[model samples]
Target chain A: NLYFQGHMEEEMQRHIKLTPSQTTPVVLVVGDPGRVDKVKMLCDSYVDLAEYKSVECTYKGQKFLCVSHGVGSAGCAICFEELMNNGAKVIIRAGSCGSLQPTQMKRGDICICNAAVREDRVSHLMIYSDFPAVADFEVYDTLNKVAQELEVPVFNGISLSSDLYYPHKIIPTRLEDYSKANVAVVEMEVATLMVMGTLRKVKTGGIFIVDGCPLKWNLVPEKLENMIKISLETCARLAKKY
Target chain B: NLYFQGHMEEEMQRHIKLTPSQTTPVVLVVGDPGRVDKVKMLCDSYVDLAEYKSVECTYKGQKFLCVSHGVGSAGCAICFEELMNNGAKVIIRAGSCGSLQPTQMKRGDICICNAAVREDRVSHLMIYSDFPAVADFEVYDTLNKVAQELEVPVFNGISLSSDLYYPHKIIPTRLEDYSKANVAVVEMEVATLMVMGTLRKVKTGGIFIVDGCPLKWNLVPEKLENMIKISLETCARLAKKY
Candidate 1:
C-alpha cells in the first residue's frame, strides 16, 4: 500500500524528521517533552536524530528510539505514522491519565492498558468506530510482568482516549458511560496509537501514571518514575525478541 | 472552569508558549508550520512570541497571532485550549482536506465548513458524542461572503474531521456512510475546534483547500493560495467587530 499522504523516507518525515534507517525497531513514545528529557537522561547513551526531538538510544545493550509525540491522538498519530513508515516494530507509550475508578485506582498507581475504547476521532476515521483499539497481547503482558518484578502499583484493563479533557454541562463526557462499561481510566492518545499499531501490524502497548481522577488530580513523582521504569524495562525485554 | 490539564497563562502555554498578554484578540490557526511561514510573509510585520514559533502579526492594520497546531484534533485541541485561555476571541483554521464529492467538488475547491460531523473522539470526550460540532454562524457566514468577494470556488456545508488519514481494509473508514450523509468533505481538526468554540463561547470557523478525494489526491498551489487569501481576509473582517 502507498504511504498515507505520500509520506516516504526519500526525505525526512514531517514532524519527527527521522528516516527509516535512523530509527530502531523498538520505540518508546511519550506525550510530554519533559519525559523525553528523562529518557535521554536514563538511557546508557543516546544520539539525537532529528529536531523533532527523536533520539536513538542504547539501554542495557538494547537499542531503540525514544520519542515524544506531544499531546492528542491526531498530532501523535502523525508521529506514529512516520515512525511505522520508518520501520519501527514495537511502539510503547508512557503517559498520564485520569482514573475513572479513583476509589480503587488512586494517585501514584500505574496502569497497564490492555485495550482502549476507541473514543478518539482519529482512530474512528481510520476504521469502523466499533473496531476495538487493542494493544499487542505480548507487549501488554510483558508490561504486566515487568511491573510485577518492579512491584509497582499496577493493574490491567481497558482505557478510553478522547480529544476532550474538560466536561461540558450540556455535552456528556462519556465518563459515566465508559466507567459503567468497566473502563479503568481515560487519557488522550492511547486509542489512536493502538489502532494505528493494529492497522500497521506492529506491537504496541501503553502504561500510564494516574495523575487525575474524576474528582481530583495530583501528579506524583514516584508513580511517574515507576511507570517509566516499567515501560523502559518492558521495551528492553521486548527488543530481545527481535 | 479550570483550565484543562492545569494549563495556565502564568508562565507560558505548553505548545505555543504565548501568554494572554502576548496574544491579540484574534488568532489565525493552521495545521502546517509552512502555512504559518506564509502568514508571517503576508503580514505587514510580525514579532516572535515564543519558541513555539508563534508570531504576533499586523495584517492590513489588524493585529493577530498566527500559529500552527501541527496535525489532528487532540494536539491541535491543546493549542486551542491554550489560545482561548490566553484571551484569543477568534480562531480560524486554514488547512487542506480531501473532497468527499469529487464529482461536484474536485481538487482546488475551497470548503467553508459551517458544521462538522463530530467524528473526532476528542470533542466527544468534552460533551455528548451526539452533540453537533458546529461553527459559529457568523464566523461561517463571514467566510462565505469574504470568499465570494475574492471570487473563489467556495461551498458551504457540513464536513467531517477524523484522526484517521488512511483507511484500512477490515475496519470501515465510514467514507461511504459520511458521503451518504452528505458530508461535503473529510478532514481532521475542524470538529474539535468548532466544539471547543461552542463550549468556550468564542468564534471558530474553517476553510480548506481540497487536495485529495476518495479517488485521488493532487495538491495544487493556486488552490492553496486562494484559500489563504480568503482565510486572512475573513480574519481581518472578523477582527473589526471586536
Candidate 2:
C-alpha cells in the first residue's frame, strides 16, 4: 500500500519533509535505520533533511545517504525503487553476508560483491531468477582500491541473497545444491537491490562484512564494527571517485 | 524443527494414541481449522478422536479428516510434507482461487486445477518457479467425471499460486509478462501441493472455488456455495475411489 499510487514519494515528502532541489547523484545505503546517523557522521554537512520512520532519510549537500531496509529482497526492492524515484545515479548496499565458500574467506573479512545470485524472493518478482544481479564494474574497482588502501581483508566474488533467515534445514542442503551451482557467498538483500538498480539504469554495488559461515558460525560484534567502518569509508571514497 | 527430525509424525502418533493399525489411508485437508467439523458432518459417523492446537485432528472411520494447515503455500507445504511423511497417498486441496480469465466462469464455479503455475514461494524453494506443478491426471479425470455427475459447474485449467495477497498494482500490467510466459489462473497453495505430491509420488489434485477476479473484481461469497458443495462431494467421491 505504501508503494501503490505513486504515493511513496509524496508520503516521503509529507512525512520526511524532504523536497530535493535536484536528485542526489550517489547514495550509500545501510540496512539499519540507526546507521543513518553513522552515515551522517561521515558527511561534511547536510543541506536538506527528511527523515521517515527511522528507515527512510534524505540529506542534501551530501551526494546521498539512505537507510537500509532490514533483511530480505522485498523490502530492499522498496528502498532501491524509492531511491531511484528520488534521483539516485548510483547505489551501493553497505551490509553483511555469511560465507558460503569459507575456504576463500572467513568471518570478519569484507566482500565487495561483484555480482549476486538472486536467491531472494523479491528478485523473482522483478525478473527471472536466472538473471544475474551484477554490480557496476567501475563501482567494484573503486571499492576494491579503497579497501586495499584501508588495509581491509576483502574478497571480490559472487554472493547469494536469500530471503528466509532461519530457513529449514532442507534449505542448507538446498544451498549445497546451489553451491554446486557456483554461488560464492550467502547474504540477505543485495541481489534485489542490484537487479532493480540494473533495470532502472542506475549503477549499483554492495559491500558486505562477513558475518558467519553458512552453518556452524558465530558473529563477533567487534569484527563487524571493524568491517563496517572499512566498508563505509570505502563507499565514501568510491562516491568521491565517481 | 517439528518437520526435520520426524517429530511431527511422532507427536501426531503420540497424541492420537492410535496403534499403527488404526491409521487410515483416506485423509481430508481443509484450509480453515474450524471447517474440520464441517467435513466431519459430511462423513457417515465421526468421532473427534484427536485435535492439536486447532491445527491437527483425527476423525474416526474409513475417512480421516484434519485441519492440516492455514492458507497459502508456505503453510500448506509444511502440512503436505508432514501428511506424506505420515503415509498420505492422495491429497485434494479444497480451497479458493481468483479467476483471472472469466468468460465461462461464474462466482462459485468450481475449477479443477489440472496444472498449476509455480508462482508460490514454497515451490520455488524446492525447484525453479518455472517448473510445472501438475495434478495426477487420473485424479483430475476422475474429479471431472464426479463433478459432471453432480451437475457442478466446473472448468479445468492452470492456476497461479502466489505468496503475497496484495501484489504491486503493476502486477496486473505485468500479467502480460506471465501470460506471455503462459501462466493461467492465479491462486495460492495449489501449485505447492501439486509439486510436493509429484516429488513424493503421491496422487494430488485441487478443486478451487472461484472467489473473485485478479483485476480487482468484487467477490460474492453466497454465489460460491453450490460450487463449494460440489468440491466437497467431489473430494468425498475421490476419497472413496482412491
Candidate 3:
C-alpha cells in the first residue's frame, strides 16, 4: 500500500520528465539512453521529449513514445513504473541481447521474446520469484508478425533478464543454467519490464537484436536498425488496433 | 573467459574515472553518486577523483577511496569490477535500505550485513544463483565490532539486494517472504558487491541505514552520517590491519 507519497503531480513527473499528456498510449523502450535518439532517426517524423529524450515519434500515422530506461532493473523499473503511471498502455522494448543458443542464433538475429525466466530481482520483489514473466499474447504475436513481414531473421521463444554482465570464478555463472533450459536470449531489462506490464495491466513485449551469443558482445550499431524498424512498425500497428 | 575485451588499461578505467595509482587498498562504496561527496565530508581530508568522484579520502591516518556504484547490478557490477581491477583489496558499501523486519528494525537502525540472499541479477550471472553472497569474515567482524564500539544501534545478520522497488501487485511482493526467512534489510547493490568481492579475492562488507521498514520509506539524509562514519572507521581499521 505504500507508494508515491506526499508528492505533487509535477514533482512526481520529474524523473522521466514527461507528463501524461506528453506520453502516448504506445511506447518503445530501450536499454541505452542514446538508443532513444537512434529510435528518433528511424521515426517517420518526431518531436523529442523527456530528460532522456522520450521521443514522441510517429510511424505510419500512429504516434508513440520512444524512451530509454537505462540499464538493470533498479533504474529500469522506475522508468516502466513512470510510463505506466503516465498512461502508457502498449509498451515494446527494442533492445540488444546475447543468445543462449549460439549454434542457432547469430549476431543481429532478432529474438521475439514470449516469456522471460524471472531471474531478475525486481520481478521477484514485485511478485513471487517463481512467477512467470510472460509477454502479452497480442504483443508477442504482433512483434513476431512484424519481424517476418519486415523479413528480418527471427528467433521466437523465452529470454532472460540478468543484472550482471561479467562473471567471477568464486560464484559460478548461471549462463549455462539458462542456456540448458533453452532460453532464446539473455538481456538486462525485459523480465522486469514484462513483470511491470503484467502488474500494471498493460501490454508489454520485447524484441532484441542479438549482439552476442553465449559470452561475446560484438555490438554493431548498424545491426540495430531492423529491431528499431520492427519495434516501430509493431507499435504503430498495435496502437492502431488498440 | 568472457570479460572486458581488447581494451587498454586507460580505457578500462574510463567508467569509474579513476586509475590504480589514484586508488587505495580500502574503498568505501555507496549507491548514489552524490554520496561520494557525503563521504568526503566525513573524511579528515580528501582529493576528489573519478567521473563519479571516487574520492581519495584520508580518515584517521588511513587512505581509502569513497566511490559510488550507481544502482542495481548492471552498473554496480562494472564499478566493483573496475575498482578491484585497479588494486582495491577491501571494499565496504554504506547504503540506505528498507528493513524487512519492521518490528525489530526501525528507520535509522544500522544493519551490518554478514550475508545477503542472492536476489540480485548480477550475482546470478557471475555465480550460481544459489551461491551465498557473503561478506568477508574479517570485514564483517570489524564492521560489527566498530558499530558496537561506536555505540550505534546495529543489527548483524543477512540482508538482501533486490533490483526492484515499488513492487507491482500482480507479481506479489517477496518482502514478507524474506522477512519470514529473517532477511535483515533489502537494498539494491550489496549482493553483487559481495559476490564480486568473493570472486575477486578481495574483502567486502556492507552497512546500511534503514530508511524504512516494511513499506514506508522515510529517508532522513542526516541519518546517513553514521553509516558513513562506520564505513570510514571500518575501512580505516581494516586497511591499517591488512
Candidate 4:
C-alpha cells in the first residue's frame, strides 16, 4: 500500500530528476496555483519550473522562489511535508486571514502569525492539542521589521487555523475564546504547516494579509483586490529574507 | 423522507397499541441486545416483553424495567430518543467506562456521572461544545446517595462520553486536561442522552461500571457482572425517590 501505484510512479520519477534552479534559502508558498504565476511575475530571471503538480509548483531564480500548494490544511500539509523532505529548510506561507479583532486590522494590513491554534482536524491527527504550532521566532521578527519598513499596519499575535470554509457559528465563538486567550487573527493552513515543520525539523513562519472581518463582515471586490496585492508583496519580501 | 418506510412503519405501529406494563421509572440501557436478558435476571418479575425490533426490548413488571439499545452512541441515541419519545421520562444509563482518573477507579468501581465532557461527535450536531451535558441534579444526588449507602466504592464526578471503543492512546492523556478541568471517567452514550435530555427537557443521568483504566487496566468479566448489578439497584431506588 505504501508503494507507488498507477500514475504515481511516473509523477515520483519526474520529481526525483527535478532540481531547484536556485538554492535560495527562502521559499514562499501560496495556496492557489494561479497565484504561483503572479509570484513568478515578481521574481527576476525565472530559472526553472522544476515540478508542477496539480497544486504544487516550484518556480525559482537566482535569489527567490515561489511555490503554490492549493488550499486547505490537508493539501497544505502534503506540500509542506514534501517540500521539507526535498531540502526546503525555511518555508514562509504568504496567505490571507480574516480578522477576529476587527479594530486591530483593516483591509491590506499585514498580520504576522506568532502562533496558530490547531482548530483544523488534520493537525490534530498529527500532534497533541497542547503541542504549540508556533512560527519560527527569527522569521517572525524579520516579518515585523519588513511590515514596519513597508509602513503597513502589522498585528503580531495568535492566528486560528480552521479547516471548514463555512464552519458552524460556534467555531468563531470558540475562536473568540482563543482570541480572549490571546489569538490575533484566523487563517486556514498555518497550524498544519507549523506542526509539520516541527515534526520534520524545518523552520517555518507565516505572514497573512488581512482580507476582511470574520464571517460577520462581507467583503467587496475592491477590498479583495487590495488584500491580494498586500499578500503578494509581503510574501515576496519574506521569501527573499528567509 | 421523514416518515418511516417499509417494515419500519409497521414495526413502530405495533408498539403504539401495547400498554407499557411496568410503572418503574428506573431503566437500564445495555449496548448488547443479549445483555437485556442478563439485566432482567436482577429483577423479581419479568411481566411484559415488547420487542419493537431485534435491537430494542422493554421488559417490565411492577418494580423494574430493562432495555438494550445495541452498541455505540449513534445506536444508543436512537434508542434514547425513542425511549423519551415513548412514555419513559426519567432514564438512567447503566453502562461501562474507561477510567480517565485511574487512581480513583479500579475494576468494578461505579462512577456516578454528574456532568459529561462530550468527546462524542454526535453530541456536537445537537448542541454547542460549551453547552454542558450535565446529569440532572436530583438524579445525580440520588445515585450518589444510593451508591454511598450500598458501599459501592463509587467515584462521583464529571465523565467523558467518547464515540470510539478503543480510543487513541493520546486521548486518555489528552483527556487528563479535561480531568484537571473536572472530568472523572469516560463512557459512550451518557453525553448523547444528557444533551438530548437538556434540549428536550427531560431528566437524564448515568452510573458507569468502570471496567478498566483508560490508560492502563483490563476488563474483568466477573467484576463487570457485579458492577452492573450494583448499577441497576442504584437506579431502581433513585427512580422512586426522584
Native contacts present in each candidate (fraction): 0.00, 0.00, 0.00, 0.00
TM-score of chain B of each: 0.88, 0.75, 0.87, 0.76
B168, model 2: CA deviation in Å?
51
Looking at model 3, residue B90 earns an lDDT score of 91
Candidate 4 residue-wise lDDT, B53-125, digit = tens:
2212222223545666434323456656556545566777877777777766677777878888777777888
lDDT of 3 at A160: 78
DockQ, Cα level, model 1: 0.01
Each model's TM-score for chain A is 0.88, 0.76, 0.87, 0.74
- The segments of candidate 3 whose C-alpha lies over 4 angstroms from its true place after superposition are A1-12, A70-74, A166-172, A215-222, B1-242
User: Scoring each candidate complex against the real one, what DockQ results?
Assistant: 0.01, 0.01, 0.01, 0.01
How does model 4 score by TM-score?
Answer: 0.42
Error of 3 at B34 (Å): 48
Give residue A145's lDDT in candidate 3 (0 to 100). 88
Task: Order the numbered candidates by TM-score, best leading.
Answer: 1, 3, 2, 4
Which numbered prediction scores highest in TM-score against the true structure? 1
Per-residue CA lDDT of model 3 for B1-242, tens digit only, reads 11111222332364676778777889888766777777888789998663354778899999888877554323456667778878889988888878888788888888899998876667777777777899999999998888788887788888878766522212227777878888888887788889888888989888988887655435666567777788888888987874
Candidate 1 residue B227 Cα shift, in angstroms, is: 53
Task: Write model 1 residue lDDT over A124-203, tens digit each, in one string.
Answer: 77888878899999998899999888887687899888777622212236778888888998877788889989988988
Sort every candidate by lDDT, greatest first. 1, 3, 4, 2
Write model 1 residue lDDT over B1-242, tens digit each, in one string. Answer: 21212123244555676667887888888776677898788777888765245778787788888887554423467777878977889998878877888777888888999899876667877888778888988888888998788888787788888766522212226877888778998878888899888989988998888877764434777777888878888888877877
Candidate 2, residues B195-227, lDDT tens digits: the string is 888878988887777766666443454445555
Candidate 3 residue pairs that clash? A127-B171, A127-B172, A164-B122, A171-B127, A172-B127
Q: Interface Cα RMSD per model, in Å?
A: 19.3, 21.9, 20.5, 24.8
